[PDB]
Symmetry: C4
Subunit: 218 residues, 4 copies
């Protein structure tokens, strides 16, 4: 009964792929994609963009329960990300790729979703994130403490709905420096900040080719 992808790795499973994990407060467990290569391996993936094949402009229930496929574009679901990040102290790794085959990454030494929320869904799965390092620059620390906002559930610090306006779903403030669940607009676009944006690397008008968000215990 591994609790995450690091337990899977330490048990002797060295190959990238889909494995069963059993978080402390999710004993039924569920399947995840494990990255067993990045910085020694043991990363549990919870988000991937790579080809714009999956619609990410989804409502609250979809972002709670998850959508897409573990072998392609997917969102694991905030209920699962909560179950994972509350059972130990996790770091976040974000891998990015542009349409010119360029790559960069952001590492956060602390990452959590609704860590102290009695009802994390009610409380809007608030983001805990700290301690940046990497090549992509920081585009997430400004989002620390913000609730998750979708097109049909607004908990941001804007007078309008940030998720509706920037066609995504994120821990929006007023509104964002990152938007990895945005529209797959494929590189440079005329529209403002409504693509797969990581502003610190490629600004507010470049939708990235590939994103992967994953967690490992520190």
């Amino acid at each position: 009964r591994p609790r995450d992808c690091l337990d899977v790795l330490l048990s002797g499973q060295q190959d990238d792929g889909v494995y069963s994990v059993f978080p402390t407060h999710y004993p039924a467990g569920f399947q995840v994609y494990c990255d067993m290569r990045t910085d020694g391996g043991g990363w549990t993936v919870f988000q991937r963009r790579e080809d714009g094949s999956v619609n990410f402009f989804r409502g609250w229930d979809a972002y709670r329960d998850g959508f897409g496929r573990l072998t392609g574009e997917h969102w694991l679901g905030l209920k699962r990300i909560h179950a994972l990040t509350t059972q130990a102290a996790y770091e976040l790794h974000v891998d990015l790729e542009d349409f010119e085959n360029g790559t960069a990454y952001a590492r956060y030494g602390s990452f959590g979703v609704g860590l102290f929320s009695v009802d994390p869904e009610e409380d809007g799965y608030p983001l805990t994130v700290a301690d940046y390092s990497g090549t992509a620059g920081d585009s997430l620390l400004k989002h620390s403490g913000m609730r998750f906002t979708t097109k049909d559930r607004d908990s941001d610090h804007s007078e309008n709905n940030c998720a509706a306006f920037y066609r995504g779903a994120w821990w929006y403030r007023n509104c964002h420096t990152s938007n990895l669940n945005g529209q797959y607009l494929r590189g440079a676009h005329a529209s403002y900040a409504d693509g797969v944006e990581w502003s610190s690397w490629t600004g507010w008008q470049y939708s990235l080719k590939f994103s992967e968000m994953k967690i490992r215990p520190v």
Copy 2:
């Protein structure tokens, strides 16, 4: 805590009948009918037609949760079929009988439902099936990759609802070569392909007497 009917058999239960199984991600478990005779035994039944006593023209929730009785005509439910087929690599056995006491079978070396779906219900319990052998001919490989479609939830490649039109529930494309959840029309019928059809054996206008779909780990 057997995970399926093969575990039940290997534990020393050799009789056909109803047993408790406990899939990896369904730890509460549920009761299934075990076929302990076919090709050495250890088959978990998830579909049976035999007398048209049970209505199979049911909606999404019915095909998710299951209906009928384990000792007669039933559908185990896609949530249970998902839980079973994701915990190991399963083969599918389909037993068929006509109203002239003729029998045939289809064996598939690979069978799965929503194998990599984050939310298999959202994703429409897509069919994985490959490697045919048997006497009935192949009527399922064309359905590989298709989502499950009911009269009240359309995910097929038709401009209309295949489930509504052919009075069934299946991994419809545009529309089908098999329709084992179709109406129990009892043998030859004037209506087109809306019966218990296995086209490769008995064509598109013969509703079979008996069908049984069951799985065993390879």
Copy 3:
């Protein structure tokens, strides 16, 4: 982790009262009242009438989930009765008392609720009951094979709703010989068969003072 009140007794708990039980397919478990005196003890109570303090003219959800208190008048809930009676072969004991301090009982060697139902709620928690003995006479064997009917969910063999007409909830045919979830009308009443009726003992116009329905493995 006792599965029922017999496990509780055999573990060395000899006192009547409330205990935790953990049925095979209900691993979370729940509290029940255990009768540790009747015919050696080990009986799991699922119904009690004694003072008409609790309303038994309730809808489908109430009879699924249960109502009242374990220490007084209650219905354990059909989901729990299903979980109990499907994990082994149970007998039913029915204790009755009139308002003249007279007592009688009915014993059934076989009792079950939705024993082979894929979805027992969908299938209406059909009654399995056989092999009568006792002093009260038989008022249940005619109900064998019937689905459970409430005022807001009709699955009986009447043109009207038996539960609505006889102000109860039961495995109604057309309509009943027993009605222990009927109105607490307190002894003889002018109204026809809408009280706590056990017809074989006290006929169709006498609402009993006390009823208790309980199960033990054979």
Copy 4:
């Protein structure tokens, strides 16, 4: 798998903070705040007021499922309080503070919520409380036996809704002597008994600065 904060303490965790507990009939478990200092420690917190940062004028579902954060103002949820208080015999400790830095406490040797309810939600999570001692005086024993009432679900002994009228959620009679889930009105207020009231200490027109309700096995 500690069942409560006393198990956490006895396992060798001596620090105040958030821990995972696994009640008998809530095996998935959940996180709670443990008080490891008060009278030897081992107290499971289920309510805290301290700064009026969280809205406590919430409906039935919120008081069932819980709200706020474990590290600040929160309500653990009646489903969790039921799961905790039914697995053993618990005492209640209530810590109070006024806006003049004055403190007092109420100890109850017996505390429970829906202890014998078949469906504690249906039954309205009725209060069991007895055996007062402390400095704050008794403001809860009059509430013993009363169901929990919210603005959108009335089970009190008033002709109006006590929760609506006194802007809280409590085991209201007609109506209250305590109201710790009332509005955070900050000390003396003109409005009648609609603040964080503990009448025996600070009367019906003083909203307390701090409240903490917590349980430990006797």
